[model samples]
Target: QQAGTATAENHPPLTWQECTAPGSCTTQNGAVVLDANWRWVHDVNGYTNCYTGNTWDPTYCPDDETCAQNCALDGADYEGTYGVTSSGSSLKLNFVTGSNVGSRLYLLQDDSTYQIFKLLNREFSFDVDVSNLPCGLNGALYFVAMDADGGVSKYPNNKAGAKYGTGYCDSQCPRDLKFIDGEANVEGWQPSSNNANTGIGDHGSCCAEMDVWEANSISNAVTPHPCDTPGQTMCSGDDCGGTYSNDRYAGTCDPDGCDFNPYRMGNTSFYGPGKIIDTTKPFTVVTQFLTDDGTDTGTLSEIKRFYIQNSNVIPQPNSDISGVTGNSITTEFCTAQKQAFGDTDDFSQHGGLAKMGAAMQQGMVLVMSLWDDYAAQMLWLDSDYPTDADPTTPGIARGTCPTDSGVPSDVESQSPNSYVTYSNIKFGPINSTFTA
Candidate 1:
């Protein structure tokens, strides 16, 4: 993972706030860096692509170490190449950028380092406009336990490092990554059947993930996926598990998290175009991480949600399920949701909220991504998943999207102009960042 000189790397400027109390905040200057996966990897001395349209050139990338030595990751044009733009305090991501479809980016504390968030007992608030993000698309804002330096100091071959957006990992253990562990994932690469620009590789990176937001105009979810490991960990073949594995639960991370989606909780009208928390316009979203002792040193006990629209402070609606009672995410609520949904209790099996809290205590890097699901067509988030199952079943129908609506090929063509905007990020102690 060496740096390329062909294109000059320039990060997009962004600004966020660090609040100590209500109405008292300090603005922090930050920037956004695109993930390495989307960048061009070419031969160091020439413009010959080392990797192109999901396949690595055998001449330059026959093996891991050789590829790392021969190829260099090039800079991004941001809005020009990837349809990503930043202004004032807002960041906008477009669904289609010419040949490129979507994007994943990390928040940078500076030009060369990531912004780490230690959010236990704190609140993270942001304003988002999902008006143009339709179903079949997901605009995600989450945190992952990745190296602050993007594995540079640890993995000697990762010369591109954080400055080039090198290190990235999550609970899903995605196999689509072209690089892993500071090397090219070329051993058993298999080009995608449907997508020409992506493929599956032998290795996958794993880490704890905190999904504060995964949403579209149709539905949204808040989930915490915990892993047994702390930072970036690599696994090979099906042993990596998650979405790419035959046995999704075979790995050390929780593939299916304990989610708190209003629609999944039996409140379909709670969020949508004209629903209670309308999605047609911009709104403020606040998530509070509450500790047992109400202090930063205490154990994280609950994750609460709130919304602000039209000057109204709207708390998350209570669960509409028969037996599940809480509005916020807790150990008890997750247990009940599992039984109620008749789903595997993988959240607890992979350490659940406790493990997620531990990872937060250790700190996490903020990630913002816009993507479309190719495997499940995003049915698990916005439609009746397990398509054959009865839609009347509790927790089965997650949103208003049709089961056949989210095919990548279909959405890519139909919703090419889709986009989402996230802005005014603020982080601080419980109830300190906003007027909740």
Candidate 2:
């Protein structure tokens, strides 16, 4: 186990560091670990460019078995080509689209098992110009806490909890041990429209969870882990146009009006007014997964938030960074499940904060990605786009993604490339400088 000193205090020890400056990893905490400077290895496909040492060389891992044990990129394949260019005093995660219509770039430090690095605060800054993007785009920087063995929860295997939508089982259900993801998202223009939906999208923040094996009848997505509903349908909820009516707070869904996945915005509303992405300007997004009182040593309460600052304030920093100072965009987690579907009562299966604490014991990793969400299926970026989350719907399908064949002709006609540039990506203790 790559364990570090476990903190009982609400706030773990922090080592602050500048976002654009290069720094070495040290002490119990670090501001930057696997930044652009980190070594680049294989294809995550288990072959090609495989090497034996920290430094790249010709010798491959010999075979798949040993490769599985030695390579960290084995299962991390989920995005476009990611490399760093020394520019603007920071590393640029210049992400380009792959053969796929949409692309997702996920840079994870360790993929084998959990590393002990209790997170308190993280920041991701970037300049994106997807205005040319024809269909849909969802570029986000996020962090997640999942089961050491991946998304599976202990209760899924339990006879009683095996069914879809089943509530917590025996009060010992590992639903809390499932997965928690928090992200600051940037969106592209709505198809045939002109607007941007940028905000915080939490999949399972505050320990919120569903199931990993069976169909979450609510979301219509089977094996939902965190940070994604994948291809699922929206359950019960009246379409309220940014209006907070009884249907807005109805038991059918959380404040975000999501049925299957547990998602909460920083505010009690959607696309309210000012808390959105301004296309012409650049911005910095800082997020901190904090505990209440900042003193509890054992089991601190969960509260995750995303902060936004105008990019003009700081010049062209980097595409990413580590830092502070911004407006509270929203708290991605903390909510109640409403209206259960089949064998499960929504309220019956709850307590994500409780379960998230246990799973965070092994700590989490920082994951950065950019993708296309044609038709706004997530109901996240913009309300104008299609709100359908289910692919089974007659006119709905996993819209043009990863391939050009399924892409809409109109969108294909636009022939635009999506770009998300990140720099100054930083993580570690909140507000503390990283100087070893």
Candidate 3:
């Protein structure tokens, strides 16, 4: 009778594993869904109010429960200040003048928290509406593969890892696998402002970034991560202290890589020009990670990250590496980055392809955020870039950032109505979200 049930010779089967342990198990994909309880993390130049300089610690302000506790008790409700609201089918991550300076609205998918979805080999789409951003303000969206312990080696769960941060917000910070920081710049259209994009970088090799990181865990893993010390799993950066060379695979810090971290790949960087951008309406940004048929790289595969605005697919914001099919992740991407910039350091002893090749296989989580540029800190938005200058000098220091010819250094006074609206956040099989 059981045999009576007919079966196709081939079928796309899904899988699941059982476990009661509390360590890094295995990762797979299912019906991908975005975590609804949005996290609005806040801080000022390192560790200040709203939070301490730690990572994870679901106790952080943005976490629903945490906000309900301290924020309300202190008469400074973050939820009231920058909470998540929903209407129709869309969600909103609100912000106000009272919102702390240098605050980040987080929507990170944590395995320990939300187990409904695994970001691997899935499509992530979101509709963003930020018609007007103050001179010094900027927003970013990324999918990163950090350490299992919130980029930290151990200390148990997200709560135990108090102050974990990766990226070059402060030198030595490790950049995530893939990132895109958006901002309104006036360099090209000097005397005016336009929407520009910037990727990760380091030292001489400016073209650094990882748009979509994907890989097969079982087939990858050049070397098993020992996950030994506290510093073993942290991303590469200044905060990484001298623990870099030890964990060379941590990548670099933010829009730029570090000589210390030494992990590089095709998605490592992007160097281009800025153009006019309509900020009066909303836009949908999407990224698709193609399957690895040995095209992009023998190991790591390629990706196409772009945005659809005004019901049309514009290529200006496109990051399509030339010289290869729309597959693989290295080679072509790396080739272009090198052609655009210069060179990179190697501390991990592994090539960019190898480092990211292995990391992507592990998987990543989607992160949406709205943060302000301290000064010329991000360089991409640095006012120093000259249209006619060769090699494009990103310059050092703010020179006169958010200050914007005198826009007040105090964020509270910048723009009272300042807020970014995010909605239609969804994840599914590639081509299922933004087919247009």
Candidate 4:
């Protein structure tokens, strides 16, 4: 397509180091694993890029099996192609993170059916002045790569002539296992690779592990085996976003032989932590998931909380407290927590989760989460302390809170991104039960 009024600046300088930056990957107990996918979304199709299918269904993109790889240059075919100077130079597109929320990017691609655009999970974000963009532009898309070495390039043609949103999924983006021939090290983007500094085909991070996305996302696009690198190896899609192989998680990568296809992010609550809070006085919530003493957070202090992370991926079953309960609780380590009764098949604590086999053996898997300034009152454990337990590392019992009202780490949430992302985050209140 032709250029809009907004200039597509050079490709952002390749800062391929952020993948391993300190504090990026989370680690709680002795167990170790890369961080999870807590990324947001950016798409010309709004934020609903979950199962776009790349289908030329007219309504959706074409199928991945035989998708059209090339994109035509008709500017009109590219949706709202205008220079939105909102941030200096911007491409606006109807956006909606309605179901899917992760680092997402959508692009136009030429296929046999109807020239369609593709969504990706492997592109970089840039800053710009989007003021010139038409106010009527509810949703448009564009990109300008700003390379650090002064080697800038513009997309749909920048790195491999690609453009808009952050390049995620799609073979043209970050192909699975196989490196992107010459496109690695383009700018501000890099996937962990065992091939030294080569920024291609390396899926080392936990988020890169499709199995994680599968067990997590309701309707995921991870069609193949993400388990190939972390868990198992199987033949499926040649791309990265949809490929994940695991004997357990995905049940034998593509066992059907035709690339065990997976769905995209189904309807799920991506909205609230639901911790209603008082608007005044920088409210916050720092919930101690597993390592709480009950002495500090027991009182249900204000501006602090400890709610469980439940959703369609993992729901609250009826017999949650029978023996096993509330998803055997695993930290980023994937160690899966045990019941207060130690590693037995008793679903007492998590009554519903008693059926879980490996979760208990995984050890004291907990997420030391902290949501300061929330309205939720007490943070209760699902079960009692384990029968074979140590005072320090015992499994949490159900219906339990912290010992007393502890202080707050209200500083971290004050950043521009954390507090300012949404209006609800700003007016939230501290729990009344907690003692200052």
Q: List the candidate 1 regions with Cα displacement exceeding 4 Å.
A: none
User: Which candidate leads in TM-score?
Assistant: 1
Clashes of 4: 136
Pairs in clash, predicted candidate 1: none
What's the C-alpha lDDT at position 77 in model 2? 22
User: Alpha carbon lDDT of residue 49, candidate 1?
Assistant: 96
lDDT tens per residue, model 4, 186-222: 1222333321212222331111111111110111111
Give candidate 4 regions above 4 Å deviation.
Answer: 1-158, 161-226, 230-320, 324-436
Deviation from truth (RMSD, Å), model 2: 16.2
Ranking by TM-score: 1, 3, 2, 4
Score residue 237 of candidate 2 by CA lDDT.
Answer: 19
In candidate 2, stretches whose alpha carbon ends up further than 4 angstroms from where it belongs are 1-98, 101-117, 120-135, 146-277, 296-350, 374-379, 384-415, 428-436
- Write down the lDDT that model 1 would get: 0.90
Candidate 1 C-alpha lDDT tens digits along 118-173: 98999999999999987799999999998888888888888998899988999999
Candidate 2 lDDT over residue span 298-347, tens digit each: 45353322323452232211111112112221112122222111112222
Judged by lDDT against the true structure, how good is candidate 3?
0.32
lDDT of 1 at 277: 93
**Backbone steric clashes in candidate 3, count:** 41
Q: Is candidate 3 or candidate 4 better by TM-score?
A: 3
Ten consecutive residues with minimal summed lDDT in candidate 3? 213-222
